Design a protein around this ligand. Structure first.
Ligand SMILES: Nc1ncnc2c1ncn2[C@@H]1O[C@H](COP(=O)(O)OP(=O)(O)O)[C@@H](O)[C@H]1O
Ligand SMILES: [Mg+2]
Length: 215
């Protein structure tokens, strides 16, 4: 019997859409900082569930281990960053990943126009959008204790979608799936991933593991 799935399409807030266009259509060196930004997000989400669990230990029923996994896939050209952090409810996903204005967005675009390094993006409260330095499409799968599993996705161009995820269940957390641009396949290489984790993400307070498919 044919399955039926609901999709909701949302417009990015106008300056977030302008920032995404600037990130995609301008050459930047130092693109590797995308991974620092996504690991930082995971670390923040791990902190949240860790503290929430102090008030309410049953919040870890959906899984006690607090960690980050990095999964390059050379066959489908994706790099996935998975955490067991707090996750996002549907409302969190729509509000925090594109609809609500970020106070730093205009300042950051001015800084970039004046020649700032793209590394400065996290300081402006818009670090997630660094994924578009290396990815043509991003899919975020997330599960929060309060709610069902959802999938957010965008290829930029001004819009994103949200749907209930019918894929593999996660117990709790977020997976960011980067569909890499053709010229950015270095970020599937185990040596390159280890290099940029060591350079930029050395003080994060949860274990990170890199899973490499046997060649
Ligand atoms: N791995 C994650 N788990 C939970 N929420 C996340 C994740 N990544 C991003 N988010 C949500 O998206 C928001 C935007 O992230 P970002 O653009 O990096 O800004 P910032 O980290 O400065 O808030 C975060 O504040 C958070 O609410
Ligand atoms: Mg961030």
């Amino acid at each position: 019997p044919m399955e039926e799935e609901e999709v909701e399409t949302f417009a990015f807030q106008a300056e977030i859409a302008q920032l995404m266009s600037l990130i995609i259509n301008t050459f930047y060196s130092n693109k590797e900082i995308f991974l620092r930004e996504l690991i930082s997000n995971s670390s923040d989400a791990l902190d949240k569930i860790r503290y929430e669990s102090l008030t309410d230990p049953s919040k870890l029923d959906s899984g006690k281990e607090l960690h980050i996994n990095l999964i390059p896939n050379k066959q489908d050209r994706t790099l996935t960053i998975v955490d067991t952090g707090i996750g996002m409810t549907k409302a969190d996903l729509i509000n925090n990943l594109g609809t609500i204005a970020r106070s730093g967005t205009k300042a950051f675009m001015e800084a970039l126009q004046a020649g700032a390094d793209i590394s400065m993006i996290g300081q402006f409260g818009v670090g997630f959008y660094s994924a578009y330095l290396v990815a043509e499409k991003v899919t975020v799968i997330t599960k929060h204790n309060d709610d069902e599993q959802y999938a957010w996705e965008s290829s930029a161009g001004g819009s994103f979608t949200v749907r209930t995820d019918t894929g593999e269940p996660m117990g709790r957390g977020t997976k960011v799936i980067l569909h890499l641009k053709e010229d950015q396949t270095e970020y599937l290489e185990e040596r390159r991933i280890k290099e940029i984790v060591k350079k930029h993400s050395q003080f994060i307070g949860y274990p990170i593991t890199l899973f490499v498919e046997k060649e």
